[PDB]
Design a protein around this ligand. Structure first.
Ligand SMILES: Cc1nc2ccc(OCc3nc(-c4ccccc4)cn3C)nn2c1C
Ligand SMILES: [Mg+2]
Ligand SMILES: [Zn+2]
Length: 313
């Protein structure tokens, strides 16, 4: 009860910043997460023993893939911690509890393949979940782990509070399907620009939490350039493996996933920054002004990809 987690000085200070990198020491990531729950939520949010047991079972159900791994889970949770800490009073007690858990669980049991590849392979998951195939799976794995003996971190919530947190988590995880992001952000854009955006409207809060989820999920584009650039290598390691698997089914993959077309990575990143990332962090900064450092870091990284195209690196 009187048992705080503390981090070395450099981590204690830098964990508060949006651009923090959790480091290569995998054994410190559980402690980094508990630290973030304790400051984001309270030392009373969860029973330490149950929380530690839940975190370790979550870790075990992430696979050893290049990008969609346990380091991604914790990295996405840290970006959410930073958003929550920079917007103290905007979020309910249930939201603070649900959202870091949602982030840690959002890619549970990912295999490193897109929803498209599962549909083309005719994977059993594509028949069970016809849209947002992997995201429905991640939510199903989250509920599984919550139901293991000694893993109910929400045990002290009422029946209706438990149902509300699991609904915050389900929507937060589904929103990480990028196919859903474009429309969500366009509706947020219209609501903000016509002044209809209302944070007391639940369907509005849902959209705003969805956009937060996209922002945390893409937060590799908000790091210092050496982090962004090295993470890109892991992102493509997966895409190119999916491309190989498309070729094995006798389907030419899109260029993004074709390793023969590596040369065009720099221009592919520009499109991504301009069509996805910048719009994401722009709309987020309009709704939640203290998230502006994410947009500034994204713009700094777009400018570094522009330098790569100009052969200046
Ligand atoms: C965090 C993060 N999440 C994602 C999701 C997708 C993505 O895609 C980037 C891209 N490369 C290409 C490309 C590359 C080589 C040859 C031709 C086209 C197209 N496109 C969209 N980048 N990305 C990042 C950076
Ligand atoms: Mg995902
Ligand atoms: Zn993710």
């Amino acid at each position: 009860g009187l048992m705080q987690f503390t981090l070395p000085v450099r981590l204690c200070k830098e964990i508060e910043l949006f651009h923090f990198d959790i480091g290569p020491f995998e054994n410190m990531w559980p402690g980094i997460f508990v630290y973030m729950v304790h400051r984001s939520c309270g030392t009373s949010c969860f029973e330490l023993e149950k929380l530690c047991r839940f975190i370790m079972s979550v870790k075990k159900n992430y696979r050893r893939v290049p990008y969609h791994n346990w380091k991604h889970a914790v990295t996405v949770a840290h970006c959410m911690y930073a958003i929550l800490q920079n917007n103290h009073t905007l979020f309910t007690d249930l939201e603070r509890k649900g959202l870091l858990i949602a982030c840690l669980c959002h890619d549970l049991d990912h295999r490193g393949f897109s929803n498209s590849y599962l549909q083309k392979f005719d994977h059993p998951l594509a028949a069970l979940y016809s849209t947002s195939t992997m995201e429905q799976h991640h939510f199903s794995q989250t509920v599984s782990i919550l139901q293991l003996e000694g893993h109910n971190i929400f045990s002290t919530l009422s029946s209706s509070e438990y149902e509300q947190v699991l609904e915050i988590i389900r929507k937060a995880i589904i929103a990480t399907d990028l196919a859903l992001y474009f429309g969500n952000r366009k509706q947020l854009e219209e609501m903000y620009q016509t002044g209809s955006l209302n944070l007391n409207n639940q369907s509005h809060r849902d959209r705003v939490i969805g956009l937060m989820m996209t922002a945390c999920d893409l937060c590799s584009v908000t790091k210092l350039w050496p982090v962004t650039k090295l993470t890109a290598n892991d992102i493509y390691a997966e895409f190119w493996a999916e491309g190989d698997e498309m070729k094995k089914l006798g389907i030419q993959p899109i260029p993004m996933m074709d390793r023969d077309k590596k040369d065009e990575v720099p221009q592919g990143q520009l499109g991504f920054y301009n069509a996805v990332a910048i719009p994401c962090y722009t709309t987020l900064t309009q709704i939640l002004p203290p998230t502006e450092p994410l947009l500034k870091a994204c713009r700094d990284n777009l400018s570094q990809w522009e330098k790569v195209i100009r052969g200046e690196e």
